[PDB]
Amino acid sequence: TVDLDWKNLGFEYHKLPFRYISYYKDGKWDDGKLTEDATLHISESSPALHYGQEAFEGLKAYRTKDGSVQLFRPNMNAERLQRTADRLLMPQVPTDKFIDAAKQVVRANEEYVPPYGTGATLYLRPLLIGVGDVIGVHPADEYIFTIFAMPVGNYFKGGLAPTNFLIQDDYDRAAPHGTGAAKVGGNYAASLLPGKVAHERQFSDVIYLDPATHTKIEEVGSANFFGITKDNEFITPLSPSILPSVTKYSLLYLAEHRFGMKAIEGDVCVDELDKFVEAGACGTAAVISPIGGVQHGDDFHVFYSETEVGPVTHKLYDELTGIQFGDVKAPEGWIYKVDD
Amino acid sequence: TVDLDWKNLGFEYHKLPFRYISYYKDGKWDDGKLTEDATLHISESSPALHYGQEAFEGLKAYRTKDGSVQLFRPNMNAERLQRTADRLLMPQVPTDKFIDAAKQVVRANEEYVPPYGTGATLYLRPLLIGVGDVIGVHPADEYIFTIFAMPVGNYFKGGLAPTNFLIQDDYDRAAPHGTGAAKVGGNYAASLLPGKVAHERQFSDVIYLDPATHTKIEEVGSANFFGITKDNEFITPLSPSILPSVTKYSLLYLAEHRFGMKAIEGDVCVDELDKFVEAGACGTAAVISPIGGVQHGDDFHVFYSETEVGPVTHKLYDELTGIQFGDVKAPEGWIYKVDD
């Protein structure tokens, strides 16, 4: 481990010594290599730049109590990137290629994986882009797959803390039959302006509703929503317009198999918020972001507290992060040791 | 003029000797320069690549009968790019900067502006992208504005010809409150898969309906729809989810001021297609693409003919292209001579 202000990293870009890069040409991926060049050199006519033919992932490497480093369910990120690629007519990066590449980046930059137990991690950003020359709208025939990395902070140093979110019905991050279930730049571009709107009213982010009818919750910025009912059920939105987070599936799994809770993907109506005794957002970067209150029109709805975080949220957070950092026994197949 | 197969260019990328490029840093655009480098060198963490923070324009330079070259309403492209930038939180490229840059590119590559009268033109592709380093979703603070060029063919060598289009209701190119009215890559990425679907059924492209209700026509691929009624009215869809083409406004204008037609932006219901004696798509690349028939569910609706093109479409096409190539007197303020 080098000497960085580990606890006070936030979540931002750092230029680390090595990234992985692989080129797709003539219907094939090359084997990939590590490069020291953090600048991409791509045609002015690259479809990633003109026609949004781009996708990314996000996953973390965690240092454990004995010093060894591990990935958490990177097979799930690979499969999500494959579905995202299909939607945008990009060639898939196979799961074994993806996971191997991720490991190569962690190993090559292992001294940047923060010490146990800062709660800090090495964040990996895989990126898949259409390059080469295309002027009429059409998929590329050349692609780049790259994974670069940066250390990121806990974000909950001081413990879990609630923040407030805004439902703002005159913005959609995705269409009903658009690219919402694909991790692509286009969805994020649409979120820039509503994000700014939320921020200027002192909310963390916007909670988006279903684009067809605007009556059901879709997601919290780029993260998934979950609610806990009085009968200790875990409920998260299910829509074909929603990005399915690895964190959400993991929480679904742990809620059931560790806590004996009914854990389902169902619709969550904005008119039934009192159904939930606790609520939060979940995702790789976020882990769990407890929701204090949600603003919708005139109304400000507080699930549990504006200052404290609920017991069930606490329990799920402790168990998920424990597994990720290796302090709690993992479900079968979830942990991928970086030196294996 | 150099020696290229002018009539048989299609619409595709060519690497010409010079492009314009200008960088935005510290809240300011530089003055711009011409460069011979057709490769962009941008951070692996550029928001254009991760968060779809990108926009483009398209406009043509036309050689006239005396050999001089001119642009057609590039002020309109500049203003559209400004609105597109606002939507994606990118700094605006001022109209005078935009038009001057376009002229510099035409002049620097003037020998690639096809001869009169091939019907071929020099296509300009301005591109505005967020670059520099950003990992959490957020606008860039560094931007590139570049304009590169390529000669493109008539596409209607053989005269205007109708093609068929498909309405396919399980895809949206944009959300009701998304980025549809902004010329950004995200909209085009969403169109890749439905485009492929259309093409494999031997249709030119998809006609998209309004994403909320799917009862009104939005646009024809990336081009605008227009219909002509039996009472010689020109009607084109108006939605806040539609990209407003310069060609559409120009056709609206000419229909009224040259042909004495009522010319309006109104809704066009998919259940009232018999309202139209002729229909087409309009845009910079397309000019006018006459629509033969439209497939919707079981039904194939032919407005005028599957093989011939209607008289009113012909008249509008002749007048618009005449103005663009300088053979017909222009409305005030439309033509921008490249050496002025």
Side-chain angles (χ1 to χ4, degrees):
Chain A
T1 240
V2 294
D3 293 317
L4 293 178
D5 194 9
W6 305 113
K7 279 177 47 187
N8 306 317
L9 297 181
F11 193 86
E12 73 182 346
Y13 180 75
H14 302 249
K15 185 182 157 211
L16 265 50
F18 300 100
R19 311 108 261 290
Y20 172 102
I21 192 166
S22 181
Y23 295 81
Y24 183 100
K25 308 180 195 196
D26 301 313
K28 312 292 184 308
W29 288 107
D30 66 29
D31 295 347
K33 69 186 186 194
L34 299 185
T35 184
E36 300 185 54
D37 195 356
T39 299
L40 293 166
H41 310 274
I42 65 179
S43 177
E44 64 192 353
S45 198
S46 294
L49 298 172
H50 298 258
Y51 303 125
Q53 202 189 18
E54 60 186 41
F56 71 92
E57 272 296 329
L59 64 163
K60 283 167 170 178
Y62 302 84
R63 194 181 297 279
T64 64
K65 204 171 52 189
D66 72 351
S68 58
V69 179
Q70 62 193 30
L71 293 173
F72 174 79
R73 302 172 94 346
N75 63 307
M76 294 295 283
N77 301 90
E79 294 178 355
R80 184 171 66 181
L81 218 210
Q82 282 148 14
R83 286 187 282 276
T84 296
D86 284 347
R87 185 67 183 196
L88 265 64
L89 267 30
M90 297 198 279
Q92 290 183 15
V93 173
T95 300
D96 63 357
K97 179 182 184 60
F98 182 101
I99 291 171
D100 175 73
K103 292 190 177 179
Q104 285 188 56
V105 176
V106 177
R107 295 194 313 255
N109 297 285
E110 200 164 308
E111 69 283 10
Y112 292 89
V113 184
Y116 183 98
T118 47
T121 57
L122 186 71
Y123 180 73
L124 268 52
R125 177 67 133 238
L127 172 74
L128 176 61
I129 48 171
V131 297
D133 308 336
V134 173
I135 273 296
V137 56
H138 192 260
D141 52 32
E142 295 175 41
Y143 296 83
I144 290 177
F145 176 62
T146 182
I147 307 183
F148 59 96
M150 64 230 70
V152 299
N154 187 325
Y155 173 50
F156 282 130
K157 188 31 197 247
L160 284 170
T163 65
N164 303 314
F165 291 86
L166 169 70
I167 299 175
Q168 186 69 28
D169 287 292
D170 50 338
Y171 303 99
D172 300 314
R173 67 143 45 208
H177 297 133
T179 53
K183 204 161 180 63
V184 300
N187 302 341
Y188 288 81
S191 80
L192 290 171
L193 180 55
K196 178 171 181 289
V197 174
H199 302 162
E200 272 162 13
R201 293 188 210 179
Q202 300 185 358
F203 295 99
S204 295
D205 210 335
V206 147
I207 291 176
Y208 297 93
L209 309 190
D210 72 284
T213 76
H214 280 248
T215 192
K216 303 168 303 175
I217 291 179
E218 291 259 295
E219 47 192 55
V220 192
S222 67
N224 285 172
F225 177 92
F226 72 87
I228 275 78
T229 69
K230 69 167 181 62
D231 299 332
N232 267 235
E233 307 152 312
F234 183 97
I235 305 181
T236 186
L238 174 49
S239 145
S241 175
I242 287 169
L243 174 100
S245 87
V246 185
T247 310
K248 161 182 82 181
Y249 286 138
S250 299
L251 285 178
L252 242 10
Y253 187 103
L254 299 176
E256 181 179 348
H257 299 296
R258 299 293 215 268
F259 296 98
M261 301 168 73
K262 178 168 118 180
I264 64 141
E265 305 185 49
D267 55 36
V268 174
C269 303
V270 280
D271 301 288
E272 65 176 15
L273 296 181
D274 33 77
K275 188 184 182 180
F276 301 114
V277 150
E278 298 175 35
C282 64
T284 296
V287 192
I288 294 171
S289 303
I291 292 165
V294 171
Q295 185 77 40
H296 193 200
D298 289 352
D299 306 316
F300 180 63
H301 188 98
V302 172
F303 300 92
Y304 184 78
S305 170
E306 285 181 70
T307 177
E308 280 145 346
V309 12
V312 176
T313 297
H314 262 113
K315 272 158 43 191
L316 292 168
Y317 180 89
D318 288 348
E319 189 83 357
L320 175 64
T321 57
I323 289 162
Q324 293 166 330
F325 286 91
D327 295 324
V328 174
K329 196 204 207 317
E332 200 75 356
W334 282 22
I335 305 305
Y336 284 68
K337 299 308 282 199
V338 145
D339 294 319
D340 283 9
Chain B
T1 240
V2 294
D3 293 317
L4 293 178
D5 194 9
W6 305 113
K7 279 177 47 187
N8 306 317
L9 297 181
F11 193 86
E12 73 182 346
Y13 180 75
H14 302 249
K15 185 182 157 211
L16 265 50
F18 300 100
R19 311 108 261 290
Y20 172 102
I21 192 166
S22 181
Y23 295 81
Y24 183 100
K25 308 180 195 196
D26 301 313
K28 312 292 184 308
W29 288 107
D30 66 29
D31 295 347
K33 69 186 186 194
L34 299 185
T35 184
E36 300 185 54
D37 195 356
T39 299
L40 293 166
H41 310 274
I42 65 179
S43 177
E44 64 192 353
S45 198
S46 294
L49 298 172
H50 298 258
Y51 303 125
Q53 202 189 18
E54 60 186 41
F56 71 92
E57 272 296 329
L59 64 163
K60 283 167 170 178
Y62 302 84
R63 194 181 297 279
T64 64
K65 204 171 52 189
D66 72 351
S68 58
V69 179
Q70 62 193 30
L71 293 173
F72 174 79
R73 302 172 94 346
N75 63 307
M76 294 295 283
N77 301 90
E79 294 178 355
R80 184 171 66 181
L81 218 210
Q82 282 148 14
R83 286 187 282 276
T84 296
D86 284 347
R87 185 67 183 196
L88 265 64
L89 267 30
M90 297 198 279
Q92 290 183 15
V93 173
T95 300
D96 63 357
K97 179 182 184 60
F98 182 101
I99 291 171
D100 175 73
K103 292 190 177 179
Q104 285 188 56
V105 176
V106 177
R107 295 194 313 255
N109 297 285
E110 200 164 308
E111 69 283 10
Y112 292 89
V113 184
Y116 183 98
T118 47
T121 57
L122 186 71
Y123 180 73
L124 268 52
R125 177 67 133 238
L127 172 74
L128 176 61
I129 48 171
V131 297
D133 308 336
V134 173
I135 273 296
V137 56
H138 192 260
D141 52 32
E142 295 175 41
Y143 296 83
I144 290 177
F145 176 62
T146 182
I147 307 183
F148 59 96
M150 64 230 70
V152 299
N154 187 325
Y155 173 50
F156 282 130
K157 188 31 197 247
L160 284 170
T163 65
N164 303 314
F165 291 86
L166 169 70
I167 299 175
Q168 186 69 28
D169 287 292
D170 50 338
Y171 303 99
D172 300 314
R173 67 143 45 208
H177 297 133
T179 53
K183 204 161 180 63
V184 300
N187 302 341
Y188 288 81
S191 80
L192 290 171
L193 180 55
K196 178 171 181 289
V197 174
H199 302 162
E200 272 162 13
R201 293 188 210 179
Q202 300 185 358
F203 295 99
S204 295
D205 210 335
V206 147
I207 291 176
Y208 297 93
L209 309 190
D210 72 284
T213 76
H214 280 248
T215 192
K216 303 168 303 175
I217 291 179
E218 291 259 295
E219 47 192 55
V220 192
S222 67
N224 285 172
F225 177 92
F226 72 87
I228 275 78
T229 69
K230 69 167 181 62
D231 299 332
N232 267 235
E233 307 152 312
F234 183 97
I235 305 181
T236 186
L238 174 49
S239 145
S241 175
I242 287 169
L243 174 100
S245 87
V246 185
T247 310
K248 161 182 82 181
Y249 286 138
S250 299
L251 285 178
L252 242 10
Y253 187 103
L254 299 176
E256 181 179 348
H257 299 296
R258 299 293 215 268
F259 296 98
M261 301 168 73
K262 178 168 118 180
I264 64 141
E265 305 185 49
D267 55 36
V268 174
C269 303
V270 280
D271 301 288
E272 65 176 15
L273 296 181
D274 33 77
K275 188 184 182 180
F276 301 114
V277 150
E278 298 175 35
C282 64
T284 296
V287 192
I288 294 171
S289 303
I291 292 165
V294 171
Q295 185 77 40
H296 193 200
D298 289 352
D299 306 316
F300 180 63
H301 188 98
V302 172
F303 300 92
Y304 184 78
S305 170
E306 285 181 70
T307 177
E308 280 145 346
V309 12
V312 176
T313 297
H314 262 113
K315 272 158 43 191
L316 292 168
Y317 180 89
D318 288 348
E319 189 83 357
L320 175 64
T321 57
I323 289 162
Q324 293 166 330
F325 286 91
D327 295 324
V328 174
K329 196 204 207 317
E332 200 75 356
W334 282 22
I335 305 305
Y336 284 68
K337 299 308 282 199
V338 145
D339 294 319
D340 283 9

